[PDB]
Design a protein around this ligand. Structure first.
Ligand SMILES: Cc1cc2nc3c(=O)[nH]c(=O)nc-3n(C[C@H](O)[C@H](O)[C@H](O)COP(=O)(O)O)c2cc1C
Ligand SMILES: O=C(O)C1=C(C(=O)Nc2ccc(-c3cccc(OC(F)(F)F)c3)cc2F)CCC1
Ligand SMILES: O=C(O)c1cc(=O)[nH]c(=O)[nH]1
Length: 360
């Protein structure tokens, strides 16, 4: 509760919280507590990584979705994350799908959600980030970068314009932007469309002043065909996209799911998604010749999970669902185990392990 013991949180606190509140209420309370610093490991130089034009104290970040409106950024750094990504944020505010829209699958250490981009909107997030803009400038310079994930409104008629608007409004406040076109919960959120979309996004980005010019990454699904991945890699290299976030939640339902809510509509996250994501990272790393930075996401809950994605090609990793089951202590746990594994496997540091599986 205030100490920081992994067993207490995993075995007592978290289980009790879930027994008292529904999943969405639990998340909202989580955001409140985090934003208030109500939280329970020292990063070694081994965990430091330099990519996307920035230094990262450690390669473990909080995935988009936990802090959709940028309300708990500072609390998240306090929790131990090497970098924070907020969003997705839509141009105009919107409520998202009706409740219930998030479901726990305890037996699978997984979650299914269909929020549908509930967002305070660009304007509100912009002011919220501006209020701590200088503080973030010092955090970034200190190895704690900030990412902003962009989405689009449900009733938007010009997808590309929605993202362009996001680039113009929040781009100046972020170290990196994410073009999220892999959410399974928005209408119909492709080589042709992607090229057109990203060309416009990059042009908008290049039009920003130097110190306010963020890297641009594309977040993709784990349900892509081989052709889709092949085309994405081609477009990425063609336009000079700075990086990829692999992956978002899956619309598939892997055989073996035990949770009673396994058939709810939405994207599945957690352990059942882990390896499908790692494999997607492996494939994208190869298709891009290891020249395009990858942020690996999907079922990371331990040092081994993180290292597998790093060895597969990820320069950084993110987690979300593991936090909902184990609580804040999982962050230090993952970092401590990653450090130990790097040593055991002969890597001088995280950097040396990036893509290691491909050079064996
Ligand atoms: C409740 C919930 C909400 C999410 N919202 C977003 C979002 O707004 N934008 C986004 O790009 N990803 C979103 N995600 C996906 C996560 O960022 C991540 O890609 C995915 O959950 C896999 O990681 P995990 O297995 O560690 O949770 C969300 C996930 C969950 C569980
Ligand atoms: O985060 C979520 O989106 C979801 C769930 C969840 O339980 N999330 C939580 C809850 C408390 C969390 C925290 C945060 C900060 C501190 C915590 O310890 C406390 F309560 F003692 F102060 C616990 C973190 C989460 F990610 C349930 C499924 C969806
Ligand atoms: O907001 C949602 O419903 C959502 C968006 C996204 O990108 N991924 C996800 O799992 N849910």
């Amino acid at each position: 509760m205030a100490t920081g013991d992994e067993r207490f949180y995993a075995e007592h606190l978290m289980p009790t919280l879930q027994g008292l509140l529904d999943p969405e209420s639990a998340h909202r309370l989580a955001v409140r507590f985090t934003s208030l610093g109500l939280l329970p490991f020292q990063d070694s130089d081994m965990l430091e990584v330099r990519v996307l034009g920035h230094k990262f104290r450690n390669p473990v970040g909080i995935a988009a979705g936990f802090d959709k409106h940028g309300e708990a950024v500072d609390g998240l750094y306090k929790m131990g994350f090497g970098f924070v990504e907020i969003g997705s944020v839509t141009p105009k505010p919107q409520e998202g799908n009706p409740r219930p829209r998030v479901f726990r699958l305890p037996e699978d250490q997984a979650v299914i959600n269909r929020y549908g981009f509930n967002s305070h909107g660009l304007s509100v997030v912009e002011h919220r980030l501006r209020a701590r803009q200088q503080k973030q400038a010092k955090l970034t310079e200190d190895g704690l970068p900030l990412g902003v994930n962009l989405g689009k409104n449900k009733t938007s008629v010009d997808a590309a314009e929605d993202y362009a608007e996001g680039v113009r409004v929040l781009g100046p406040l972020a170290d990196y932007l994410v073009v999220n076109v892999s959410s399974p919960n928005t209408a119909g959120l492709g080589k042709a469309e992607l090229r057109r979309l990203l060309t416009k996004v990059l042009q908008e980005r290049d039009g920003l002043r130097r110190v306010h010019r963020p890297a641009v990454l594309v977040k993709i699904a784990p349900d892509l065909t081989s052709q889709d991945k092949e085309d994405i890699a081609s477009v990425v290299k063609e336009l000079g996209i700075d990086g990829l976030i692999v992956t978002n939640t899956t619309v598939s339902r892997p055989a073996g799911l035990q949770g009673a809510l396994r058939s709810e509509t939405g994207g599945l996250s957690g352990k059942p998604l882990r390896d499908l994501s790692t494999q997607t990272i492996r494939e994208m790393y190869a298709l891009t010749q290891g020249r395009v930075p990858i942020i690996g996401v999907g079922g990371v809950s331990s040092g081994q999970d993180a290292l597998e994605k790093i060895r597969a090609g990820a320069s950084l990793v993110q987690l979300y669902t593991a936090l909902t089951f184990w609580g804040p202590p999982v962050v230090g746990k993952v970092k401590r185990e990653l450090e130990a594994l790097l040593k055991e496997q002969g890597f001088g540091g995280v950097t040396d392990a990036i893509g290691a599986d491909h050079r064996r």
